[PDB]
Structure formats: structure tokens, C-alpha cells
Design a protein around this ligand. Structure first.
Ligand SMILES: CCCCCCCCCCCCCCCC(=O)OC[C@H](CO[C@@H]1O[C@H](CS(=O)(=O)O)[C@@H](O)[C@H](O)[C@H]1O)OC(=O)CCCCCCCCCCCCCCC
Ligand SMILES: CCCCCCCCCCCCCCCC(=O)OC[C@H](COP(=O)(O)OC[C@@H](O)CO)OC(=O)CCCCCCCCCCCCCCC
Ligand SMILES: CC1=C(/C=C/C(C)=C/C=C/C(C)=C/C=C/C=C(C)/C=C/C=C(C)/C=C/C2=C(C)CCCC2(C)C)C(C)(C)CCC1
Ligand SMILES: CC1=C(/C=C/C(C)=C/C=C/C(C)=C/C=C\C=C(C)\C=C\C=C(C)\C=C\C2=C(C)CCCC2(C)C)C(C)(C)CCC1
Ligand SMILES: CCCCCCCCCCCCO[C@@H]1O[C@H](CO)[C@@H](O[C@H]2O[C@H](CO)[C@@H](O)[C@H](O)[C@H]2O)[C@H](O)[C@H]1O
Lengths: 504, 488, 55, 41, 53, 44
């Protein structure tokens, strides 16, 4: 061990192992020792994640665990302070799981495999660095750590409008991490201490007016990363023009930071401004759901339709954040894990059927399900998981968000009536698009103009293995939610009890 | 006071190195170019090595009120000497490839180095002027050194015009400071002899600020910089963007904190305007530059605005952020100019469009220019991220919120034109690569000076990547050079 | 029989048309846990009487 | 309430060994049926 | 259509009106050295005038 | 715009600037109305 630096090893071991990528011998050029080395590093890091979790993480402790705090730069208060909370540990486990599955799903790449698996391991160490660190300047560092890796994963591999997508992504995310640094420096220079630690910054007492400004800066910075529909248009370009492993860890994990940090430094740090801004967050989550379901329906592209569905499923996260109950916050964390699994399965399957059919337009690709039957089966199962089907993890989080919002007596009664009415029309709208695209992509008679040009080969055993590894925790959490809720029910119980002290 | 000639031993070693390089190229000729770059490298290393015993000394004002050997001047002397060391490591193959002599080039460069190192600590107004015009005249001669090129001749002429005008404006300011303080030329004597703002002190302040911001390349005085960096030899503009700018910032810290510690709000408003509009016009005009040297010129103007953020705050941490950013900016800009040198030596071109597809031909050059340009952009694991982090940390501390917000916004704008070059080298397809990269030579580090090029590139890239996370010895080395600044 | 088109449109129409009622089953279920708070048929049978006979 | 830790500790070596096994079980992308390089363009 | 036109129009317009101010701010640096020294002297005059009220 | 006017979503005069303008003011005005209503009707 419990004195071993665990989260420092978890963060830095994929980066240090990615520095050994150009020294791996590979005479054939296609990059098979590089993909096996990256899969080995991903599996070893996930094994160390689950070993630290099952030994040195206590499920009944609301405070920070696995705590390390090394002294980086004492002049400015820069410390390497890492820690595993209840808001962090499901996302750390999900990051390890989805990044290992994305490295395994990244196996058809042969364009620049050394650079590809270097960037994927440098995202593996750097995604966990967002959920793990407890210093605000290191939070800004780990937040901006995905600027150049996602740029090069977007711009070299995947898509025809990939350069504009990568450009808009990197400029938009840099202009939002601007506000990350501004709000962190503002709330760390408040009062007569320059402690940059996130617990000490949550322990301060900021006046209102300062809290509203820091919440506005954090809200811009997280409403870009979490897709909030005025600030969401980086996502359909940056996700409709990405390869399937990059899209897997791009909307399975990178949308969850910014949504993890909506709890960490907007609810747990500025509750007096959260109590002022929470009706706006509830309405913006409702508009996320309905708006992105409608734009999912109108998309004739496949990847942009699934990208807009990924925008739609975080509105329940927003409603669960801005509802002041334990079940609402628990359903918000449950949605940011369940949508990670469900979405990553959908992006992998969309990339698989694009690697087979060589087209993204729903007006092509007619009776494709006659030839790839396993891709049809897995795609129907994961699309059903997206529809909030019970027995799968997408329904439980949405039901908990609905119940935890409607029972929240902090809001008025017509507000709760209008919101849970409007949040429930996405229950209609998600089967509409996600079954019209199934009807248009896999069903019907076989498109003979397509099968003459492309080899419609069925799924590999590796792809069936990846979708089964994604669907096992989906069904296992939708059948028994206290597998996951028991990881974070203490800390969220610490958060809501800290955030209900402001409401009248 | 009392003469302390043991202070000048870095500059004395460098003057002796200058004389030995010149006498060797007079005795042996062009065949003296086979060993005198390494002798100039050993002389610069000896100057930096003799700066190490001086760091553990008191303030020890050296000549008769004419030189300060404290840690601030020692830091800036080591910075200018390291800039010239990297410049000599870059200009071995490049100067010999143009048919020019390397020894006369190296003596004008070492004269510019001793001029900058004498600017770095200077109390006399006339010593400030003599060292400033040693650096200025050596920079004009280094600018048009490739005199068969029309662009180098034009850059030298319009550099000498602007520099002589700014020198005469600086001299009118220095003459007004000599008259306003009675008859004093030392900067503490001028600070004691005038202690209240008046019309005439503001005039001398703005005249000196114009003569200094010519070297800083602040935005109304930036206009020499794109033409000079497009026209001059590329190691000359590497030295002009690192060592000349560091000498100008040494002059600003030495002058405005010593000669004007009474109109501090006035020159802080002036440098606030300079920083704001320098960041703006340096980071939005580099979006449209299609040459790498002109883009590096406008980016250097933007970096000067970022340094002036920390200069204009006026606290100890602000001066420390300026010093640390100049220190890491040395590494990242010498690495970027080393890659520009190494690409123009093999392709003969400079356009950013001609960098397309370099990833498979020369992977070390793309790794080097990628790491240094992204460090210039502010990308986390590299040095410039931590430099900008310190520049904004000190600047949110003393309430300069608008400057920190503008610096972050123009850094986001800066990311685009740096990532355009990284997109050319790394992202562009093999079927979309340029004509210079299709006809790329075999990578060979054995011609005349490509092995010092590779050594300087590896050293600057290892510095600009590793020394962001190992910055705490650099923070300790910088924050003791700030205690020798008045009013902190 | 996914090779047929009418079976495809009928299956999608059946899921969406049943979901038009599940919208509303979920609404009344959430609103009855809001009003009553039991999730039990005999519970919200008589707790609804305890509510509506009061103000 | 059952604990997630013995379930996760019993399912992760199976996950690691089956990742290492199902890496060696691909039959479309390593053949000539796949006309691509892994990028989606 | 609202999403692709209006919101992406605000985003691309932000990215566009920062490109035409630098494709039109580079003409402030026009190749004439005497214009550059004129700008230097106008700056000297303007900073004296604005530093005294 | 023309890539959205194919197949199921195929309506004449959908990508016209008048229709885009009236649908923009309708959608974004209901956004602003819902946000102002949430700030006014809901308490905390
Ligand atoms: C909410 C606040 C968050 C941010 C705050 C800080 C702002 C940061 C400003 C940084 C922008 C400056 C960089 C220069 C831009 C440039 O060169 O253009 C680059 C491209 C155009 O060139 C394109 O570029 C592509 C490639 S390229 O280099 O030419 O490779 C090319 O293929 C394509 O044809 C070409 O058109 O344009 C962009 O994609 C810029 C997008 C950046 C968006 C900035 C934030 C915008 C916030 C809007 C909020 C909307 C909400 C309102 C809804 C009602
Ligand atoms: C976290 C850090 C993330 C930084 C992201 C910047 C990536 C910049 C990539 C530029 C191109 C790389 C040169 C390419 C090169 O030099 O090697 C050449 C080698 C080429 O292999 P390929 O399989 O891609 O070759 C195929 C091509 O020839 C055509 O198909 O590439 C690699 O091995 C991976 C590159 C990783 C090297 C990046 C190291 C970054 C270190 C910085 C970390 C600082 C920490 C302190
Ligand atoms: C615009 C849009 C949105 C909004 C939305 C809203 C506006 C919606 C609404 C909607 C609607 C508002 C819903 C409704 C629903 C209803 C239902 C669906 C129906 C039902 C009916 C029933 C089914 C039947 C009944 C009958 C009668 C008829 C008679 C007697 C008998 C009985 C009772 C049986 C937003 C802004 C976010 C953004 C994007 C866009
Ligand atoms: C890692 C991670 C962790 C953990 C998890 C675990 C805990 C899981 C559980 C699990 C459970 C303990 C299990 C139970 C149950 C299972 C189920 C029962 C399964 C099923 C399967 C099926 C059989 C399928 C089938 C198929 C597929 C393959 C595809 C499509 C088609 C079909 C559907 C036919 C957490 C927490 C953080 C979350 C996230 C992730
Ligand atoms: C040890 C302290 C200092 C750390 C310094 C950091 C750099 C580490 C040493 C890198 C230099 C050795 O680099 C070594 O040689 C060359 C560089 O030409 C490269 O070698 C490479 O050659 C070609 C591509 O060029 C590949 O097909 C091959 O698989 C790979 O080995 C590798 O990088 C490494 O094999």
C-alpha cells in the first residue's frame, strides 16, 4: 504493498512503454510486433489497475484513496498529487478496459503503426492522468495532453474531411482548456494561500460572484468537452471522421472527462454557483437529448449519426449532475460508464461495417445483414443497448436519472413535470433513428450494386470477442447495478450532502 | 569603486577566442575552418564554465560603477553564450556551403556575443551604448553576410536603417537622462538624482523604450524582424531571435528597474500596450506566412509578447517567469532553427508547403521540428508549456487578468500555425508529398558540419522535451537571479 | 426474415409504436414514485387514497 | 449485496488470456479480402 | 440544417474572422524601411502623448 | 447541405437561407425561452 506508487505507475507506464516503440524490431513493416507490444502494455496496465483496485481501494471510504503527493515544483505549488476517489475509480477502470479493447480493435492499421500505437499508449497514459491527479495545474496538463495525440490520430487515419475535423478539434479544445487554466488560477489565488490541490480548493469558501465567474469558465471548458449543444459542433466532424479505435476511446473516455470534472470542480468545489446554474444545466441536458436525437435521425452518414447519438446520451449525465439527489448523481456516473461501454461497442461495429462495405451513406448498403450475420447480430444487440433496454446498462442509469430528478424537492413542481416530460421524448426518439438505420443498413433485400464491388465478409473472432467483452459488463450492470454503484455510492453521498447545504 | 577584472573573465575568454579564430584564419586561411568552430565552441564553454565560480559570489559591482556581476547578469551572459554556442553548432556547414569564410563569420558572431554579454550587466550609459552598438553593428554585418543574395543585402540595409534610427533615438534618451540627472551616467546615480515624473523624463523613457523594443521586436518596432529573418542567413536569425532578444530583455530589466524606478507605472502601461498588441500581431500574422523563417519571425514577436507579460507584472515571480521562458525559448527556438537549417541544407527551400511528407525520408528532422514547434505552441510534456504556465501563474498573481487571457487566446491561435508545419511533416500522405521531399538526399551526417548539426539538434530537443518536467533546478537557478532586481 | 422489407418496416414500427406507450408508462411510473414513493401496486393503491383525500 | 472485487479479480485474468488468444484469431484483415490500411479513407 | 449552418457558422466565422486580420494585417509590414521608421517615430510620439494624460 | 438532402431526408427548400433562418430563430428561441423559464420558474 500500500506504500507503492500505484497511480503514478498507472499513468506513467504506458508513456514510458510508448517511448520504447521505435526501438522494437520490425522487418516486415506492417507493424505486428508493435501491435503485440501495445496490447501487452495495455493488458499489463489494466491488470495493475484492477490489482490496485481490488487490494488498496476501499468501497466504504468517501475520501481520496491510493493517495500520492510528490513535490514537483514547490515555487508555484506544482505537485504530482494523484488519488482515486469514487468519481475517479469507475472511470479509471473504464479507461483501462476501453483503451485495452481499443488497442485490440486497432489491429487492422498498417499505415503508420509505430506512430499509431505510440499515440494510443500516450493516450492510455494521459486519460487516466485526467481522472487520477488532484492538482489543478497537473489537471490542466493532463487535460491538454490529448491535444496532439487526438490531432494526429484524427488527421493521419480515418475520414475524408479529417484535416478540417482535426483542426477544429485542436483549436476548440485548446480554446476551452484556456478556461480550465483561467478558472484554476482564479480559484487557487483566492484568499491568502496558493495551494493548488483539488481537496484544498474544494475546502475553501469562495463568495458568490466569484463562484459564478469560475463556474462560467469551467462551464465553457466542460460544455465543450462534454457535448453541450451550443458548444458541440467539434464532435460530429471530429467523430464522424475517425477510425474505430480512435472513435472508441474518443467518445468512450474523452467525453467522460468533462463530466467527471463537472462533479469534481463544479459541484464539489462551487456549490453556491451550482445551485444557481443547475436549472440551466437541466435544460441543456434535455436539449442535448432531444436535439442530438433529431440530428442523429437526420444524418445520412453513419459515423456522424452515431456521433450525434453519443451527444444525445450525455444529456442524462447533465440532468443527473444538476439534480440534487443521491440517485440522480449515481445515475449520472452510471450513464458516463454505461455510455462509454455501449458507445465504444457501437463505434467498433460501425468501423467494422465500414471496413467491409467501404461506404458510410445509408442510401447505399442495403441488405448487408444477409452476408455479415454476426455484425448484424452484434450491431442489433449494441443498438438495443443504446435504446435504454432493461437488462442492459443503458436503462438503469436513465431510470435512476429520471427518478432522482423527479424526487428532487429542491425544484418546483411544474419545472420537474416539464423536464421529465421533455427528457422522456428521447425515449421515443432513440429507437426512431437507431432502428431506421438498422432497417436501412442491414435489413431488406441485398444491394447488388454494393456486393459486386466489395467483399461482404462476416466478423472475425476478434471482433466478436471485442463486442462480447463490451457487452458482458453492459448486461452485468443492467441486471445488477450495485456491481458499479457500490464503487461510488460513498463519495457521491459525500458530494450531494456537500451540495445540498446551499438550497433553501 | 574599485576595478574587479576577474568579473570580465567570460567576456575576456571570449575576446581571446575571437582573436585566436581571426588570427588562425589569417594564418591558415579557409583550411583553418576545419578546427576553429570547435575552438570557438570550447571558448564559449569555457566562458560558461567560468561563470560557475562567479555564481557563488556577492553582487560585486565590477568596474568603476560600470558593470554588475550579480546572478541576473550571469544568467543573461550564460543565455547569450549558449545562444552563440548553438549558433556556431548550426553554422558550420551552412556558411561553408555558401562559399563564404567561416572565421570572419565566427569573429563577427563572437563580437555580437561579447556585446550582448556586456549589455547583460551594464550601469554606465556609455557602456550600455557601446555594447548595444557592438551587438547592433555585428548584427548588421551578420545579416548581409551572404552578400551575393539580394535578400540578404536588402535585409542588411533595412536593418541598418531601422537600427541606426533606433540607436539615435536611444542615444537622445540617454543624453536626456545624462542632462536630467545633473551630470550622472551610472543608472543608480540617475535613480538617485531624479525621483519624480516630469515631462522630459517621460520623453527619455519612451526614447529608451523605443531603442530597447527595437531589440525586443515589440509591435510598433517589430517591422525589421520579418524582413531580416527572411533575408539574413538562418543561423544569424537564430542568434537574433534568441541571443539578441535576450540581450534586449537584459537591457530592459537592467535599465527600467535601475534608471527608472520612479515612472514604473508609465513604462508598465507602455509595455502593457506593447505586450498586448505584440501578442496579437505576432500570433495572427504568422497564420498567413508561407515561409518558415518569416513564420518564425512573427512567432518570435509573439513570444516576445509572452515574455513581456511577465516583464510588465513587476513582481519577483514575473521577472522569474520571464527568465525561465527565455531559458526554455533558447532550447525550443534553437531546435526549430536547427531543423530549418537541416532541411534547407538538403532541399534548398524554405516554404512550409515543401515540408510535406518528410516523415519517412528524415524521421529525426520531423521529430526535432515537431517537438520544438509544439513546445513553442505550449504542448504539455515539453518545456514551453511549463514556461507559459509560469508566465500565466505570475500574472494572475498580480492581477493582470486581461494579459493572461490574451496570452492564452493567442497561444491557442499559435497552435494552428505550428500544427500546420507538424501536419506538413507528419500528416501528409506519401502521394501528397512535395517536390523537395521526393528528391530528398540520403541522410548522411559526415560531410563537413552535419555531425555538429545533429549534436546540437539532439541536445536542444532533449532539452526542450525533458526540461519541462525537470524544471525545478531551472526554477531554482532562475529565482536567485531575481533577488538582484530592485523592488522585486 | 430480415431479407424482407415489409417485415423490417413492421418490426421497426412495432418497436416504435410500443415505445410511444412506454413513453407514458415510464412517465406515470416516475410520477407515481414521485407522488407515492413505493413502486408497489398495493402501496400506491392506498397511499394515493391517503394523498388525494388530503389537500 | 455481493462485492465487485472477487468478480473483477476472477474475470480479469480470463480477459487478459482471451485478449492474448483472440489476437491470434483474425481472418479478414490479414487476408486479401481487406482492401485498406486500417485508416477509414 | 440549423446545426450544420448556424452553429457551425458561428464556429467557422470565429475561425474565419481571425484569418482575414493577418491576411490584411500583414500589409502593415509592406517592405519599405522608411515607412517602418515612420511607424517607429509615430509610436514614440503616441507613447509620449498617451503617457502624459 | 446537399449531402443531407438525400434519401429519407429529402425536402425541397430545406437548405434555403429563409427556411434555415426561420428554423434557427424557432429552435434557438425555444432554447432561450426554456433557459429563461428555468431560471425563473425553478427555484435553485
Ligand atoms: C466557447 C469558447 C471556446 C473557445 C474560446 C477561445 C477561442 C479560440 C480561437 C482560436 C481560433 C484561431 C485559429 C485560426 C483559425 C483558422 O485558421 O481557421 C481554421 C479553420 C478553417 O480552415 C480550414 O482548415 C482545414 C485544414 S487547414 O490547416 O487549412 O489544415 C481545411 O481543410 C479547410 O478547408 C479550411 O476551411 O476554421 C476552424 O475550424 C476554426 C475553428 C475554431 C473555433 C474556435 C472557437 C469557436 C467558439 C464558437 C462558439 C459557438 C456557439 C454559438 C452557438 C449559437
Ligand atoms: C506525451 C507526448 C506526446 C507528444 C506527441 C508528439 C508526437 C510527435 C510525432 C512526430 C513524428 C515522430 C517522428 C518519427 C520517428 O522519429 O520515428 C520513426 C518511426 C516510424 O515508424 P512508422 O511505422 O510510422 O513508419 C511508417 C512510415 O514510414 C510510412 O508508413 O515512428 C515511431 O517510431 C513512432 C514515433 C514516436 C516518437 C515520438 C517521441 C515523442 C517524445 C516526446 C515525449 C516527451 C515526454 C517528456
Ligand atoms: C424543437 C426541438 C426540441 C423541443 C422539443 C419539444 C417541443 C418536444 C415536444 C414534444 C411533444 C409535446 C410530446 C408529446 C407527446 C404526447 C404523446 C406521445 C401522445 C399521446 C396520445 C396517446 C397515445 C393517446 C391518447 C388517447 C386520446 C387520443 C383519446 C382518449 C383515449 C386515449 C387517452 C388512449 C428542443 C428545443 C429540445 C431542441 C431541438 C428541437
Ligand atoms: C471492467 C470494468 C468494471 C467491471 C465490470 C465487471 C464487474 C462486469 C460484470 C459482469 C457480470 C458478472 C456478468 C454477468 C452476466 C453476463 C451476461 C449474462 C453476458 C451475456 C452475453 C450474451 C450471451 C451475449 C450474446 C451475443 C453477444 C456476444 C453479441 C451479440 C449477439 C448475442 C447477444 C447473441 C466496472 C465495474 C468499472 C464497469 C466497467 C468495466
Ligand atoms: C540514453 C540516454 C539518452 C537518451 C537519448 C534518447 C534517444 C535514444 C537513442 C536513440 C538513438 C538510437 O536510435 C537507433 O537508431 C535509429 C536512429 O537512426 C533507429 O533505428 C530504426 O531504424 C529504422 C528506421 O529508421 C527502423 O526500421 C528500425 O526498426 C529502427 O531500429 C532507432 O531510433 C534506434 O534503433
Amino acid at each position: 504493498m500500500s506504500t507503492f506508487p500505484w497511480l503514478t505507475t498507472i499513468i506513467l507506464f504506458p508513456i514510458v512503454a510508448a517511448l520504447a516503440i521505435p526501438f522494437i524490431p520490425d522487418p516486415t513493416g506492417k507493424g505486428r510486433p508493435i501491435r503485440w507490444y501495445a496490447l501487452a502494455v495495455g493488458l499489463i496496465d489494466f491488470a495493475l489497475i484492477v490489482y490496485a483496485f481490488t487490494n488498496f481501494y476501499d468501497l466504504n471510504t468517501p475520501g481520496m484513496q491510493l493517495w500520492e503527493s510528490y513535490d514537483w515544483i514547490p515555487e508555484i505549488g506544482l505537485r504530482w498529487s494523484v488519488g482515486a476517489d469514487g468519481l475517479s475509480m469507475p472511470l479509471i477502470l473504464l479507461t483501462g478496459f476501453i483503451t485495452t479493447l481499443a488497442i485490440l480493435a486497432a489491429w487492422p492499421v498498417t499505415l503508420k503503426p509505430r506512430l499509431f500505437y505510440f499515440l494510443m499508449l500516450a493516450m492510455y497514459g494521459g486519460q487516466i492522468a485526467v481522472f487520477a491527479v488532484q492538482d489543478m495545474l497537473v489537471f490542466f496538463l493532463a487535460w491538454e495532453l490529448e491535444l496532439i495525440p487526438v490531432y494526429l490520430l484524427l488527421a493521419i487515419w480515418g475520414g475524408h474531411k479529417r484535416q478540417y475535423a482535426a483542426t477544429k478539434f485542436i483549436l476548440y479544445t485548446a480554446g476551452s482548456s484556456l478556461f480550465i487554466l483561467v478558472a484554476g488560477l482564479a480559484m487557487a489565488f483566492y484568499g491568502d494561500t496558493v495551494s493548488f490541490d483539488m481537496q484544498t480548493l474544494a475546502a475553501k469558501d469562495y463568495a458568490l460572484g466569484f463562484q459564478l465567474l469560475v463556474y462560467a469558465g469551467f462551464l465553457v471548458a466542460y460544455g465543450v468537452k462534454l457535448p453541450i449543444v451550443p458548444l458541440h459542433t467539434w464532435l460530429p466532424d471530429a467523430h464522424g471522421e475517425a477510425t474505430a479505435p480512435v472513435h472508441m476511446l474518443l467518445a468512450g473516455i474523452l467525453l467522460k472527462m468533462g463530466g467527471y470534472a463537472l462533479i469534481r470542480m463544479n459541484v464539489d468545489m462551487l456549490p453556491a454557483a451550482h445551485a444557481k446554474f443547475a436549472p440551466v444545466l437541466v435544460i441543456l441536458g434535455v436539449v442535448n437529448i432531444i436535439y442530438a436525437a433529431l440530428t442523429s435521425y437526420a444524418q445520412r452518414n453513419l459515423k456522424r449519426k452515431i456521433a450525434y447519438s453519443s451527444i444525445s446520451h450525455i444529456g442524462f449525465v447533465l440532468i443527473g449532475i444538476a439534480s440534487f439527489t443521491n440517485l440522480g448523481m449515481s445515475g449520472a456516473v452510471l450513464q458516463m460508464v454505461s455510455h462509454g461501454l455501449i458507445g465504444a461497442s457501437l463505434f467498433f461495429l460501425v468501423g467494422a461495417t465500414y471496413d467491409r462495405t467501404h461506404t458510410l451513406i445509408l442510401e447505399e448498403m442495403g441488405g448487408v445483414g444477409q452476408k455479415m450475420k454476426k455484425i448484424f447480430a452484434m450491431f442489433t444487440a449494441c443498438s438495443l443497448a443504446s435504446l435504454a433496454l432493461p437488462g442492459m446498462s443503458g436503462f438503469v442509469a436513465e431510470l435512476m436519472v429520471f427518478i432522482g430528478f423527479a424526487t428532487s424537492d429542491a425544484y418546483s413542481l411544474p419545472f420537474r413535470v416539464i423536464v421529465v416530460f421533455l427528457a422522456a421524448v428521447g425515449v421515443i426518439l432513440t429507437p426512431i433513428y437507431l432502428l431506421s438505420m438498422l432497417r436501412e443498413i442491414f435489413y431488406g433485400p441485398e444491394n447488388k450494386e454494393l456486393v459486386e464491388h466489395e467483399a461482404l465478409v462476416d466478423a472475425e473472432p476478434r471482433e466478436v470477442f471485442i463486442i462480447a467483452c463490451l457487452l458482458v459488463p453492459i448486461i452485468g450492470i443492467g441486471l445488477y447495478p450495485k456491481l458499479l454503484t457500490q464503487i461510488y455510492d460513498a463519495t457521491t453521498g459525500q458530494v450531494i450532502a456537500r451540495a445540498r447545504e446551499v438550497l433553501p | 569603486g574599485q576595478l574587479n577584472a576577474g568579473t570580465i573573465l567570460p567576456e575576456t575568454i571570449l575576446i581571446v577566442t575571437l582573436l585566436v579564430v581571426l588570427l588562425a584564419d589569417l594564418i591558415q586561411g579557409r583550411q583553418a575552418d576545419r578546427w576553429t568552430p570547435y575552438f570557438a565552441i570550447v571558448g564559449l564553454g569555457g566562458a560558461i564554465a567560468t561563470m560557475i565560480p562567479l555564481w557563488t559570489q556577492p553582487a560585486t559591482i565590477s568596474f568603476f560603477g560600470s558593470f554588475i556581476s550579480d546572478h541576473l547578469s550571469l544568467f543573461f551572459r550564460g543565455l547569450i553564450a549558449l545562444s552563440a554556442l548553438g549558433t556556431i553548432l548550426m553554422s558550420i556547414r551552412y556558411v561553408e556551403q555558401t562559399g563564404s569564410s567561416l572565421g570572419e563569420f565566427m569573429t563577427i558572431l563572437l563580437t555580437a556575443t561579447v556585446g550582448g554579454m556586456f549589455i547583460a550587466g551594464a550601469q554606465e550609459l556609455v557602456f550600455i551604448f557601446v555594447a548595444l552598438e557592438t551587438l547592433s553593428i555585428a548584427s548588421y554585418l551578420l545579416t548581409g553576410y551572404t552578400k551575393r543574395d539580394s535578400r540578404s543585402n536588402e535585409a542588411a540595409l533595412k536593418y541598418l536603417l531601422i537600427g541606426a534610427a533606433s540607436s539615435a533615438i536611444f542615444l537622445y534618451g540617454s543624453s536626456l537622462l545624462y542632462g536630467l540627472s545633473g551630470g550622472h551616467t551610472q543608472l543608480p546615480a540617475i535613480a538617485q538624482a531624479l525621483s519624480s515624473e516630469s515631462l522630459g523624463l517621460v520623453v527619455a523613457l519612451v526614447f529608451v523604450i523605443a531603442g530597447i523594443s527595437f531589440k525586443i521586436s515589440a509591435v510598433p518596432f517589430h517591422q525589421w524582424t520579418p524582413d531580416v529573418y527572411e533575408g539574413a542567413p538562418t543561423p544569424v536569425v537564430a542568434f537574433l531571435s534568441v541571443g539578441s532578444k535576450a540581450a534586449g530583455f537584459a537591457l530592459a530589466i537592467r535599465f527600467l528597474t535601475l534608471a527608472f524606478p520612479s515612472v514604473t507605472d508609465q513604462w508598465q502601461l507602455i509595455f502593457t500596450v506593447l505586450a498586448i498588441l505584440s501578442m496579437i500581431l505576432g500570433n495572427v500574422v504568422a497564420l498567413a506566412q508561407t515561409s518558415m523563417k518569416r513564420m518564425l519571425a512573427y512567432s518570435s514577436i509573439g513570444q516576445a509578447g509572452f515574455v513581456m507579460i511577465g516583464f510588465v507584472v513587476g513582481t519577483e515571480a514575473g521577472y522569474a517567469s520571464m527568465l525561465f521562458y527565455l531559458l526554455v525559448y533558447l532550447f525550443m527556438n534553437l531546435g526549430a532553427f536547427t531543423c530549418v537549417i537541416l532541411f534547407s541544407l538538403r532541399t534548398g527551400t524554405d516554404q512550409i508547403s515543401e515540408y510535406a511528407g518528410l516523415y519517412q525520408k528524415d524521421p529525426l528532422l520531423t521529430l526535432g521540428l515537431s517537438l520544438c514547434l509544439l513546445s513553442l505552441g505550449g504542448i504539455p510534456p515539453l518545456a514551453g508549456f511549463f514556461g507559459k504556465i509560469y508566465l500565466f501563474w505570475a500574472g494572475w498573481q498580480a492581477g493582470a487578468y486581461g494579459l493572461v487571457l490574451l496570452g492564452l487566446l493567442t497561444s491557442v491561435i499559435s497552435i494552428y500555425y505550428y500544427i500546420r508545419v507538424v501536419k506538413m511533416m507528419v500528416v501528409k500522405e506519401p502521394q501528397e508529398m512535395s517536390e523537395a521531399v521526393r528528391n530528398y538526399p540520403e541522410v548522411s551526417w559526415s560531410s563537413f558540419g552535419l555531425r555538429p548539426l545533429q549534436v546540437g539538434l539532439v541536445m536542444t530537443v532533449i532539452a526542450t522535451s525533458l526540461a519541462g518536467i525537470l524544471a525545478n533546478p531551472l526554477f531554482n537557478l532562475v529565482n536567485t537571479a531575481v533577488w538582484d532586481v530592485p523592488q522585486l | 426474415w430480415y431479407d424482407r422489407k415489409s417485415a423490417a418496416e413492421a418490426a421497426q414500427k412495432a418497436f416504435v409504436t410500443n415505445r410511444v406507450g412506454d413513453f407514458g408508462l415510464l412517465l406515470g411510473m416516475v410520477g407515481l414514485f414521485w407522488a407515492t414513493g413505493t413502486f408497489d401496486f398495493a402501496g400506491m393503491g392506498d397511499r394515493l387514497t391517503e394523498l388525494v383525500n388530503t389537500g | 449485496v455481493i462485492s465487485v472485487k472477487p468478480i473483477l479479480l476472477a474475470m480479469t485474468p480470463v480477459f487478459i488470456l482471451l485478449c492474448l488468444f483472440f489476437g491470434t484469431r483474425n481472418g479478414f484483415y490479414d487476408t486479401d479480402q481487406y482492401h485498406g490500411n486500417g485508416s477509414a479513407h | 440544417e440549423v446545426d450544420y449552418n448556424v452553429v457551425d457558422g458561428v464556429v467557422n466565422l470565429t475561425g474565419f474572422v481571425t484569418m482575414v486580420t493577418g491576411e490584411g494585417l500583414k500589409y502593415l509590414q509592406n517592405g519599405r524601411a522608411q515607412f517602418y521608421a515612420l511607424i517607429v517615430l509615430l509610436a514614440v510620439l503616441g507613447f509620449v502623448i498617451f503617457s502624459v494624460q | 447541405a446537399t449531402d443531407f438532402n438525400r434519401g429519407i431526408m429529402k425536402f425541397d427548400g430545406a437548405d434555403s437561407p429563409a427556411m434555415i433562418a426561420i428554423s434557427a430563430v424557432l429552435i434557438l428561441g425555444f432554447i432561450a425561452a426554456l433557459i429563461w423559464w428555468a431560471l425563473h420558474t425553478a427555484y435553485a
